[PDB]
Design a protein around this motif. Structure first.
Motif, PDB file in Angstrom:
ATOM      1  N   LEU A 179      43.763  25.630  28.089  1.00 56.22           N
ATOM      2  CA  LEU A 179      43.671  24.061  27.624  1.00 56.22           C
ATOM      3  C   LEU A 179      43.494  24.014  26.391  1.00 56.22           C
ATOM      4  O   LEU A 179      43.200  23.015  25.853  1.00 56.22           O
ATOM      5  CB  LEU A 179      42.557  23.566  28.424  1.00 56.22           C
ATOM      6  CG  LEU A 179      42.777  23.440  29.947  1.00 56.22           C
ATOM      7  CD1 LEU A 179      41.736  23.198  30.817  1.00 56.22           C
ATOM      8  CD2 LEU A 179      43.853  22.438  30.099  1.00 56.22           C
ATOM      9  N   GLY A 180      43.406  25.045  25.442  1.00 57.22           N
ATOM     10  CA  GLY A 180      43.375  25.055  24.007  1.00 57.22           C
ATOM     11  C   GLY A 180      41.873  24.628  23.553  1.00 57.22           C
ATOM     12  O   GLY A 180      41.639  23.959  22.548  1.00 57.22           O
TER      13      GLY A 180
ATOM     14  N   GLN B  70      39.907  17.885  28.550  1.00 57.17           N
ATOM     15  CA  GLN B  70      41.229  18.234  28.467  1.00 57.17           C
ATOM     16  C   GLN B  70      41.872  17.965  29.790  1.00 57.17           C
ATOM     17  O   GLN B  70      43.148  17.448  29.739  1.00 57.17           O
ATOM     18  CB  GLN B  70      41.534  19.620  28.117  1.00 57.17           C
ATOM     19  CG  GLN B  70      40.890  20.192  26.619  1.00 57.17           C
ATOM     20  CD  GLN B  70      41.287  19.090  25.560  1.00 57.17           C
ATOM     21  OE1 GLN B  70      42.156  18.681  25.514  1.00 57.17           O
ATOM     22  NE2 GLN B  70      40.115  18.523  24.993  1.00 57.17           N
TER      23      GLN B  70
ATOM     24  N   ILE C 243      42.965  14.347  29.416  1.00 57.48           N
ATOM     25  CA  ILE C 243      44.288  14.131  28.624  1.00 57.48           C
ATOM     26  C   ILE C 243      45.466  14.442  29.454  1.00 57.48           C
ATOM     27  O   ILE C 243      46.479  13.799  29.308  1.00 57.48           O
ATOM     28  CB  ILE C 243      44.144  15.080  27.494  1.00 57.48           C
ATOM     29  CG1 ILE C 243      42.844  14.321  26.578  1.00 57.48           C
ATOM     30  CG2 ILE C 243      45.344  14.796  26.473  1.00 57.48           C
ATOM     31  CD1 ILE C 243      42.584  14.956  25.095  1.00 57.48           C
ATOM     32  N   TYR C 244      45.448  15.597  29.998  1.00 57.87           N
ATOM     33  CA  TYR C 244      46.598  16.047  30.823  1.00 57.87           C
ATOM     34  C   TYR C 244      47.069  15.113  31.945  1.00 57.87           C
ATOM     35  O   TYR C 244      48.246  14.928  32.085  1.00 57.87           O
ATOM     36  CB  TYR C 244      46.559  17.487  31.483  1.00 57.87           C
ATOM     37  CG  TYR C 244      47.099  18.624  30.699  1.00 57.87           C
ATOM     38  CD1 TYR C 244      46.290  19.138  29.527  1.00 57.87           C
ATOM     39  CD2 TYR C 244      48.442  19.236  30.671  1.00 57.87           C
ATOM     40  CE1 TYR C 244      46.637  20.174  28.865  1.00 57.87           C
ATOM     41  CE2 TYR C 244      48.777  20.215  30.011  1.00 57.87           C
ATOM     42  CZ  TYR C 244      48.060  20.736  29.121  1.00 57.87           C
ATOM     43  OH  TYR C 244      48.498  21.924  28.420  1.00 57.87           O
TER      44      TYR C 244
ATOM     45  N   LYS D  30      45.995  11.831  31.853  1.00 55.00           N
ATOM     46  CA  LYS D  30      46.370  10.371  31.505  1.00 55.00           C
ATOM     47  C   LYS D  30      47.766  10.339  30.996  1.00 55.00           C
ATOM     48  O   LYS D  30      48.310   9.508  30.791  1.00 55.00           O
ATOM     49  CB  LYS D  30      45.342  10.190  30.347  1.00 55.00           C
ATOM     50  CG  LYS D  30      45.776   8.877  29.498  1.00 55.00           C
ATOM     51  CD  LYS D  30      44.678   8.322  28.585  1.00 55.00           C
ATOM     52  CE  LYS D  30      45.227   9.410  27.321  1.00 55.00           C
ATOM     53  NZ  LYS D  30      44.530   8.941  26.116  1.00 55.00           N
ATOM     54  N   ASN D  31      48.432  11.817  30.838  1.00 54.69           N
ATOM     55  CA  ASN D  31      49.774  11.874  30.369  1.00 54.69           C
ATOM     56  C   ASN D  31      50.605  12.315  31.494  1.00 54.69           C
ATOM     57  O   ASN D  31      52.053  12.528  31.157  1.00 54.69           O
ATOM     58  CB  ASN D  31      49.840  12.856  29.138  1.00 54.69           C
ATOM     59  CG  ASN D  31      49.403  12.503  27.646  1.00 54.69           C
ATOM     60  OD1 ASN D  31      49.352  11.334  27.667  1.00 54.69           O
ATOM     61  ND2 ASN D  31      48.578  13.303  26.921  1.00 54.69           N
TER      62      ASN D  31
ATOM     63  N   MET E 134      50.953  15.229  33.133  1.00 53.11           N
ATOM     64  CA  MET E 134      51.385  16.467  32.925  1.00 53.11           C
ATOM     65  C   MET E 134      50.538  17.527  33.932  1.00 53.11           C
ATOM     66  O   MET E 134      50.745  18.683  33.519  1.00 53.11           O
ATOM     67  CB  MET E 134      51.253  16.921  31.547  1.00 53.11           C
ATOM     68  CG  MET E 134      51.954  15.684  30.424  1.00 53.11           C
ATOM     69  SD  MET E 134      51.699  16.231  28.742  1.00 53.11           S
ATOM     70  CE  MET E 134      52.497  17.525  28.767  1.00 53.11           C
TER      71      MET E 134
ATOM     72  N   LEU F 235      52.181  20.722  35.116  1.00 57.04           N
ATOM     73  CA  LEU F 235      52.261  22.048  34.220  1.00 57.04           C
ATOM     74  C   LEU F 235      50.966  23.024  34.447  1.00 57.04           C
ATOM     75  O   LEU F 235      51.427  23.943  34.101  1.00 57.04           O
ATOM     76  CB  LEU F 235      52.198  21.548  32.885  1.00 57.04           C
ATOM     77  CG  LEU F 235      53.315  20.746  32.422  1.00 57.04           C
ATOM     78  CD1 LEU F 235      53.312  20.327  30.840  1.00 57.04           C
ATOM     79  CD2 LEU F 235      54.800  21.089  32.704  1.00 57.04           C
TER      80      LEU F 235
END
Lengths: 387, 387
Positions: free
Chosen positions: A282-283, A304, A307-308, A310-311, A313, A316
């Motif tokens: 997740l960076g 994070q 964020i994934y 909300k996008n 994604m 992935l």
């Protein structure tokens, strides 16, 4: 602080059972017969769950029948294309082609009649739906919040239908949110499946059956689709429900700090070193030095996740077709998809090895609390939720 | 008349073996060493069959690799689409996305290198092909016809590779045709597969790999595709070969009349009543009264085969996915697809029942000659070709 554990997030009856049992909710004193109102909710939920099941099956049967129709119509017209080109002296060939069409025109007639019968059952379902939701909305006016000072962690049911996130469960999670109950849901494989399906429903053009599906086999997707198709709820209504009462509760991993220890909450049993693997994916910069550092790393993992999510994604993170057995992932696989390991792993004797789950680390205690798993660890600091 | 039976139509060595053995063909007396020239043909055919096998495998591997490439390129650009939309404060998310791309860019690099290696082997194959065909064309100048008064019935090999209709077999069938040899091929399941594949090759736009394929798994399709792609033969050349030397020989069922009997030639063992079922499917009026009537019905069946074939509609006769076991078709299935039964049926004790294959019918004798089948009937008037 006061905290309780549940699986969930559904199903609706289990969650209601659990909320009554821990005195989170109670019937308003104006209700004349608590037992009668309770039984009505059970009936309502059993009625709704049957309707969603029937709808999914009817919808599955209509998809297969339309394949049968389209294939028959194509084969008949291909033959008709050939008949139109025959010659005056190919009279056996013409009769041959007619012979070949006759069984296909039979199947086409049969499939068209089955479709009509299924569309008959589907419309009968749709007349029963509004009053069922009407009776549920009435039940939701009969309860009120009680203890508001108790935190609820939902660690996720391990099987699908038992913890399914039906519309009723969603409405109950909104009720708790509107009454300022602290709710945290630990994301499971089923939680991811639900979100993935939901994103299909709230994106334009509005989902029309059918359709790329497919499946969308999960029941929670079908009941929302049924409700949207019959205008029981609007896309804005559903987006509102999910964005305000469900998504902000989701955690990959959760924690609580004591004076000298951390407790780690997860859906599956997991090795301590899975957290670093997840931070890598997740960076997030992984800091282990103190319990506060670890807590701060986990907060960033969950940030994070948002964020994934909300996008749109998440797939992935949670879909990897190359993994052989997600319940017993290899170390190479654990590094590859840390988040899949976090929600799928099942424990066994071979994994109950020293250093898998330390009870002391970098100077602080560690305690592990996770959703139900058949294996029972004798470690005093591992808590394995029951079903 | 003088008649002989073979399986076939291929493979080329078997057919050449058989033509030498029955004195249909012989080396021209100008050949200095018959054995040496014969061994050269075996070598040439073994070289060509290996090249077609390698070509099919390389082609299968390139199709799978292009899937790997296209899926990787899509996933990288989807992630790149998301990175381009990130915000200045989602710095962990950006690093997360880069992490996710790195293994995909690795697989893409690996797959691109495998493809280059396969295209390396493919081009090396293509330099060896012309001289191999050149050496075969030389062999075809070394033989001449001998006995021209012998009819050849090819009842079809039961397995694919042993009777396969490679380019060499086609050229040999043309040689026999150009020398006025009477050739009759009884259509088999493999014969149908060959025709079906060939129609793909001679229709515009010219077939480009790849491609809807798929398969086209049969080797005989791949070698023709290889020859066409490398300009060894033209589509007009191939159409000429197949339309003049192969298609006009094809029979669904064949016969010969004696003074008081009929002999029935088929690929599989078949019940006498299968002929009427086939006439029904092909639009032919079935007449059984005399051996001449039955012969006239069979001639009309074969005439209808030519019409279906000239219209590229054979798949309507020879493909039925609903059949469970084409080698043991139910009576309902036999009526449904008579021609599939005719080429797939395998005999057993349960089918060797009175009235299955009468030896006398409507006043004339009946004799049955069919391609190889493990079961050995003790009926004196049933002939089961050996392998």
């Amino acid at each position: 602080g006061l905290e309780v554990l549940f699986q969930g997030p559904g199903n609706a009856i289990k969650l209601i059972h659990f909320l009554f049992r821990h005195k989170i909710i109670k019937f308003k004193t104006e209700i004349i017969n608590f037992h009668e109102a309770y039984q009505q909710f059970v009936t309502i939920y059993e009625q709704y769950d049957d309707m969603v099941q029937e709808y999914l099956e009817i919808r599955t049967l209509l998809q297969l029948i339309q394949i049968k129709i389209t294939n028959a119509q194509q084969r008949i017209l291909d033959i008709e294309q050939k008949l139109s080109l025959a010659t005056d002296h190919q009279k056996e060939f013409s009769q041959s082609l007619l012979q070949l069409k006759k069984p296909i025109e039979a199947n086409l007639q049969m499939a068209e009649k089955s479709k009509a019968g299924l569309e008959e059952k589907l419309s009968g379902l749709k007349t029963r739906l509004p009053s069922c939701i009407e009776r549920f909305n009435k039940f939701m006016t009969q309860i009120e919040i009680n203890d508001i000072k108790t935190l609820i962690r939902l660690l996720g049911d391990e099987v699908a239908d038992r913890g399914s996130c039906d519309y009723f469960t969603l409405r109950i999670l909104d009720f708790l949110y509107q009454n300022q109950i602290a709710i945290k849901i630990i994301l499971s494989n089923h939680g991811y499946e639900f979100i993935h399906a939901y994103e299909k429903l709230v994106v334009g053009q509005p989902f029309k059956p059918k359709g790329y599906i497919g499946d969308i086999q999960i029941k929670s997707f079908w009941g929302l689709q049924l409700l949207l198709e019959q205008s029981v709820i609007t896309e804005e209504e559903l987006r509102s429900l999910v964005e305000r009462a469900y998504k902000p509760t989701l955690k990959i991993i959760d924690y609580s700090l004591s004076e000298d220890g951390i407790t780690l909450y997860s859906h599956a049993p997991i090795r301590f070193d899975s957290i670093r693997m997840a931070a890598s994916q997740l960076g997030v910069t992984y800091n282990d030095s103190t319990k506060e550092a670890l807590a701060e790393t986990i907060d960033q993992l969950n940030a994070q996740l948002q964020i994934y999510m909300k996008n749109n994604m998440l797939h992935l993170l949670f879909e990897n077709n190359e993994i052989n057995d997600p319940t017993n992932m290899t170390d190479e696989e654990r590094n590859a998809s840390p988040l899949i390991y976090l929600v799928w792993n099942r424990w066994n004797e071979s994994k109950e090895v020293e250093n898998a789950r330390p009870g002391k680390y970098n100077g602080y205690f560690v305690t592990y609390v996770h959703g139900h798993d058949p294996f029972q660890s004798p470690l005093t600091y591992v808590y394995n939720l029951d079903t």
